[PDB]
């Protein structure tokens, strides 16, 4: 074998402790750059003029933040969707003021995480597996694309991308509610059904398999020792599990087929989260939640408030207060 | 099929961006103003209003220190101020006559704005592509009254959803085509499990 | 792919019980605190700094401004027994909006 | 910044006490007969 042939054999080797592969050739450097920049920025970055109004917001630990308040702050509204790599700045000091780290991080991250998804297909192929784990990962990935790329595109600025920080995330959520009434949007509602249901079914499946473990141990040892890695025989009794759950509800509401059950476990959260991602990605173009403001009116024409109108009052509070020095004109159009 | 699904997905996302930003092959006369367009149109509207009242819009300093109506882009071009600073790359027939070599021209702004420009900016500002799923026009806190969602929003959202699911279909079918070609799409052969012939990782 | 993996099916399935169940139990404890208004509302160090230094801003201080808007704008209709009348002039608002 | 002056010891013991409990248990497991 020549050098290229050998290199290819190593890259695609099924024997590396962590699989590299061709997607990994892009994933490794991009994820390392994003990680390193993030860590350094989160600790040490100076304040960033997120809203382009010369009002710098401090995100880093050394500049007065704790783990909860800290963030890498989105790039300046003055930049908008302009590409702002380090070399476009006159200095690192300028780059930092304008939120250059945010763009470097999210672009390397999105590239790296897309390659992470490809890499999941890639290894499944090398191991002779079925290929669709990567399709499940497309759900959180799509969600990351929605908040870091698609929303900024629709609104015309990376300053409206989700901040890389715990409190910045909450800021993004509250402002999103004000501007899109996301709670009243059916795609976010499907998302909630996806994650509440995902958690429910996770607990359900956990509890049912755990409930029907076949006795292989004594009381002075963990029942976990009753299962040996790679054993051929199933470790629980699915017939007893189905016997239980089918009586809890009724026979035909319970799965007796493990393949069907596990497919449902994959599908429910993944589809819901795809809708969550699509909610963000379509509210990115301002097709917003249901608006029933003043929908109910009496015989004279008096407005009779519903809970939708109370939501509206909360939303107004968010709207009027957010970015309190950034608006000069009466309508918030992006 | 998978190759075509990948291609159509790509095209879907491109079409989404085309209808969101482009006002040439998607004329605003027919599709409504773009998001960038309507935001710029708002700044234009109030510049006109306040200048009619006697404001000197070039020297008017906003609360932040940036110009209330007019400021510089990061490369120095004169652009509208407030949040629409992000939209300074917007270009449209109603705005361009006010543009000089250095961006928005203050002498043109002071002297050359025509009633058709005021009308257009007012029209576009009040038909911004924001609206609810039940087609209540305007911001999310707006009251029922105006039955409006921009065709630009309908076309961008639908095509994002379609492009996204087509990427999923691409992955589904590309991964399946690979597995079927190699002969393991139905599962692992119990008597020939590949991992069992591989050395342990540790 | 990830560096680690399950090797024990019994552990895997117990963990699937543990995680969402423990999460829900934790959220419940927080709500018990909120019954008493015993909130995590503030970071005191943040407030002391921001009160003395009008250039100090974090996403934490930004979210409190949003909260203050929510409270003032929603309370009169959301809490009708209080008979709140907040004149236009007292309502917290940023510029223009 | 005007932080709570007990936050440092609170955090350090919060980490060290249970971490140490686990390390003690782990090491004495390892030292048991194979």
């Amino acid at each position: 074998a020549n050098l290229w042939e050998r290199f290819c054999n190593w890259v695609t080797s099924t024997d590396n402790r962590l699989y590299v592969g061709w997607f990994g050739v892009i994933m490794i450097p991009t994820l390392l750059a994003a990680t390193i920049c993030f860590v350094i920025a989160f600790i040490a970055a100076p304040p960033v003029d997120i809203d382009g109004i010369r009002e710098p917001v401090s995100g880093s630990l050394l500049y007065g933040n704790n783990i909860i308040t800290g963030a890498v702050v989105p790039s300046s509204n003055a930049i908008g969707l302009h590409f702002y790599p380090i070399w476009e700045a006159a200095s690192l000091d300028e780059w930092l003021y304008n939120g250059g780290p945010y763009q470097l991080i999210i672009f390397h991250f999105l590239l790296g995480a897309s390659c992470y998804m490809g890499r999941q297909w890639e290894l499944s192929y090398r191991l002779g597996m079925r290929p669709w784990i990567c399709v499940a990962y497309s759900a959180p990935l799509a969600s990351a694309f929605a908040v870091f790329l698609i929303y900024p595109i629709g609104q015309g600025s990376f300053s409206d991308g989700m901040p890389l920080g715990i409190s910045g995330t909450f800021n993004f959520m509250i402002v999103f509610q004000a501007e899109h009434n996301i709670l009243m949007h059916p795609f976010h509602q499907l998302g909630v059904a996806g994650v509440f249901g995902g958690a429910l079914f996770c607990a359900m499946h956990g509890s049912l398999v755990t409930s029907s473990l076949i006795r292989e141990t004594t009381e002075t040892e963990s029942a976990n020792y009753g299962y040996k890695f790679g054993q051929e025989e199933e470790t629980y009794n699915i017939v007893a599990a189905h016997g239980y759950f089918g009586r809890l509800i009724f026979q035909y509401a319970s799965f007796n087929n493990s393949r069907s059950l596990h497919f449902f476990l994959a599908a429910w959260p993944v589809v819901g989260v795809w809708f969550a991602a699509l909610g963000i990605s379509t509210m990115a173009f301002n097709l917003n939640g249901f608006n029933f403001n003043h929908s109910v009116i009496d015989a004279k024409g008096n407005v009779i408030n519903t809970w939708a109108d109370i939501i509206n009052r909360a939303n107004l509070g968010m709207e009027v207060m957010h970015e309190r020095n950034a608006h000069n004109f009466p309508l918030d159009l992006a | 099929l998978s190759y075509s699904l990948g291609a159509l997905s790509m095209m879907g996302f491109i079409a989404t961006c085309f209808v969101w930003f482009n006002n040439t092959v998607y004329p605003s006369e027919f599709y409504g103003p773009t998001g960038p367009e309507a935001s710029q149109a708002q700044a234009m509207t109030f510049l006109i209003r306040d200048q009619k009242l006697g404001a000197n819009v070039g020297s008017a300093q906003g609360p932040t220190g940036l110009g209330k109506y007019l400021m510089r882009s990061p490369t120095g071009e004169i652009i509208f101020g407030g949040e629409t600073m992000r939209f300074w790359d917007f270009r449209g027939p109603w705005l361009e006559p006010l543009r000089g070599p250095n961006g928005l021209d203050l002498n043109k702004i002071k002297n050359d704005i025509q009633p058709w420009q005021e009308r257009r900016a007012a029209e576009y500002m009040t038909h911004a592509p924001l609206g609810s799923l039940n087609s209540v026009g305007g911001v999310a806190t707006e009251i029922n009254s105006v039955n409006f969602v921009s065709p630009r929003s309908w076309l961008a959202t639908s095509h994002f959803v379609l492009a996204f699911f087509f990427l999923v279909g691409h992955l589904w079918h590309a991964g399946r085509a690979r597995a079927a070609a190699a002969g393991f799409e139905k599962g692992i052969d119990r008597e020939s499990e590949p991992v069992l012939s591989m050395p342990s990782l540790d | 792919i990830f560096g680690i993996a399950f090797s024990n099916k019994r552990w895997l399935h117990f963990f699937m019980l543990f995680v969402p169940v423990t999460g829900l139990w934790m959220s419940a404890i927080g709500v018990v605190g909120l019954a008493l208004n015993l909130r995590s509302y503030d970071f005191i160090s943040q407030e002391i700094r921001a009160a003395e230094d009008p250039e100090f801003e974090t996403f934490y201080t930004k979210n409190l401004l949003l909260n203050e808007g929510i409270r003032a704008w929603m309370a009169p209709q959301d809490q009708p027994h209080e008979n709140f009348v907040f004149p236009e002039e007292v309502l917290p608002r940023g510029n223009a909006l | 910044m005007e932080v709570n002056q007990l936050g440092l010891i609170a955090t350090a013991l919060f980490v060290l006490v249970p971490s140490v409990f686990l390390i003690i248990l782990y090491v004495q497991t390892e030292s048991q007969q194979k």
């Binding site: 402790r17 783990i67 790679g230 | 540790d202 | - | 936050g7």
Partner: peptide
């Protein structure tokens, strides 16, 4: 002191990742 604490905990977690991956008990088929 707070910053030191936060970074210290983070650094311990990263070290933990390293040991949990490269120095895990190996899975063995019985």
């Amino acid at each position: 002191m707070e910053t030191i604490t936060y970074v210290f905990i983070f650094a311990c977690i990263i070290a933990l990742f390293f040991f949990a991956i490269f120095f895990r008990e190996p899975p063995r088929i019985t």
